[PDB]
């Protein structure tokens, strides 16, 4: 008698959704290696003093396979639509690909806008790389604009490396799932 919540993490390839899930679920990784596989994992969380089971599902590897992806979407309680803050392409892909898909397959199911790799915002090398394209990282303001426009519950940032705001992302996900 403890209700389980299904959280499905989607988004562009190499935004670090797998690294996100792994960093949230466990530590004690030697941290020099980036594991590519995240198996479905149940996590007991405390909300308002009440325990819930957060089921965690990864979608990495299925990016190029549009027909295979929606096999994971049924029975989903909440979606995490991820994009890298140092990758304008992923940011655009949230608008052009992911949100329309998950809203098409699950219209009534809530989804969060997740910005990842915030720790790379102050990386001069990354700033140079983006500067070559006359580009720049995603500002929280712009992303919140996008979130409000696409009717996402809210916009959350996190760094799997720094674990800044990482746990609160999932907390907010569970909260959004528990909306009447």
């Amino acid at each position: 008698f403890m209700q389980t919540i299904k959280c499905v993490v989607v988004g562009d390839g190499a935004v670090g959704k797998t690294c996100l899930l792994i960093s949230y679920t466990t530590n004690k990784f030697p941290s020099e290696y980036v594991p590519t596989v995240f198996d479905n994992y149940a996590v007991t969380v405390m909300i308002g003093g009440e325990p819930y089971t957060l089921g965690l599902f990864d979608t990495a590897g299925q990016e190029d396979y549009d027909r295979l992806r929606p096999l994971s979407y049924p029975q989903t309680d909440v979606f995490l639509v991820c994009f890298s803050v140092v990758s304008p392409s992923s940011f655009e892909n949230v608008k052009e690909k992911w949100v329309p898909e998950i809203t098409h397959h699950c219209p009534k199911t809530p989804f969060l806008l997740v910005g990842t790799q915030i720790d790379l915002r102050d990386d001069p090398s990354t700033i140079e790389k983006l500067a070559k394209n006359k580009q720049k990282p995603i500002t929280p303001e712009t992303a919140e604009k996008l979130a409000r426009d696409l009717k996402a519950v809210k916009y959350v940032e996190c760094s799997a490396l720094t674990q800044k705001g990482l746990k609160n992302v999932f907390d907010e996900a569970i909260l959004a799932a528990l909306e009447p």
């Binding site: 479905n40 599902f57 590897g61 396979y65 549009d66 027909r67 295979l68 994971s72 049924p74």
Partner: protein
């Protein structure tokens, strides 16, 4: 001086070992999962079919639910064994995996049947869960299997293969990354990567064409008074559908038009539709009618977004009209593409 180069050199090997180890371990875990699916559920319902059937589990349901999961398992027992053999006793730097991936490529096609069926399976599952004794039974299997209620349910375990098969290429890209250029494994790794990507491509496209076929089946099932051979016999996919005004033999009827590769159908919209007619595109001439034209085909009506269709087999003609220019362009271009592709 050379010690820095040595440090880096070994630092790479560490990572390569990490890759190999992740492959092996995740494989073991996957096989373990499938094994659990077999022993906890299948073996139990097979032990006593009376209870399963009485409590609401016909063999049809089992068959649809689990698909060909046991065949996949039989494949991965052998594949895992091959991996254990190649990585004896533990992953080493000079070990070369690519060939074990290449050796097992054409073995993986088994997945094609599973994924395509899975969409039905889960949709069946949701029904079975609404039945009290069935849901209770399916929980009982989980409990007697030693695993918990909070733990991942049957659904995820059934989902696992489609996740698994799509992850091998990533593993292989990281592996190709950590593999030196002159390393004997390098080309085999690249090749294995390409093969494993092709596998996923085949699975995906298989599911797609299957779904298109099922779309045709559905469309035929929703049409009353169908004449001639079935769409499934002579068609592969639906290209375009829409509403047009049909002027034929003096009659003015608004009809629902469906363009399939090889033929075009028109129906009366009430099943949802009543079959009105079909035309093989191989004997169909579509001729554009300039807007404003009024002839005997159109009974004298002034034409906008209209054209004439000729069934040569019966030497019959009739007028089709749209409400928007975009619709006209749509149908015209679609027919053009169909005819273009049918020849080659």
């Amino acid at each position: 001086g050379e010690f820095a180069a040595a440090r880096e050199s070994e630092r790479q090997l560490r990572l390569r070992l990490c890759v190999l180890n992740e492959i092996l371990g995740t494989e073991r875990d996957y096989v373990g999962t499938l094994r659990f699916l077999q022993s906890a559920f299948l073996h139990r319902i097979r032990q006593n079919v009376a209870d399963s059937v009485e409590k609401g589990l016909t063999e049809e349901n089992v068959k649809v639910l689990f698909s060909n999961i046991e065949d996949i398992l039989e494949v991965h027992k052998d594949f895992l064994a091959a991996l254990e053999y190649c990585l004896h006793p533990e992953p080493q730097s000079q070990h070369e995996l690519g060939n074990v991936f290449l050796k097992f490529k054409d073995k993986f096609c088994v997945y094609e049947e599973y994924c395509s069926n899975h969409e039905k399976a889960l949709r069946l599952l949701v029904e079975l869960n609404k039945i009290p004794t069935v849901r209770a039974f399916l929980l009982s299997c989980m409990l007697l299997g030693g695993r918990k209620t909070t733990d991942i349910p049957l659904e995820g375990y059934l989902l696992s293969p489609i996740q698994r098969i799509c992850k091998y290429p990533l593993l292989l890209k990281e592996l190709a990354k950590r593999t030196p250029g002159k390393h004997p494994d390098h080309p085999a790794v690249q090749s294995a990567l390409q093969a494993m990507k092709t596998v996923c491509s085949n699975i995906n496209e298989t599911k797609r064409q299957m779904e298109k076929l099922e779309a045709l089946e559905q469309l035929q099932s929703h049409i009353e008074g169908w004449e001639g051979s079935n769409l499934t016999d002579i068609c592969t996919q639906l290209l375009l559908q829409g509403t047009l005004l049909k002027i034929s033999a003096g009659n003015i009827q608004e009809r629902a038009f469906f363009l399939f590769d090889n033929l075009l159908v028109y129906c009366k919209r009430k099943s949802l539709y009543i079959f009105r007619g079909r035309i093989n595109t191989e004997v169909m001439e579509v001729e554009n009618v300039e807007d404003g034209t009024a002839d005997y085909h159109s009974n004298g009506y002034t034409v906008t977004n209209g054209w004439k269709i000729h069934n040569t087999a019966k030497n019959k003609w009739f007028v089709c009209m749209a409400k928007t220019a975009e619709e006209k362009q749509k149908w015209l271009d679609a027919i053009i593409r169909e005819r273009e592709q049918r020849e080659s």
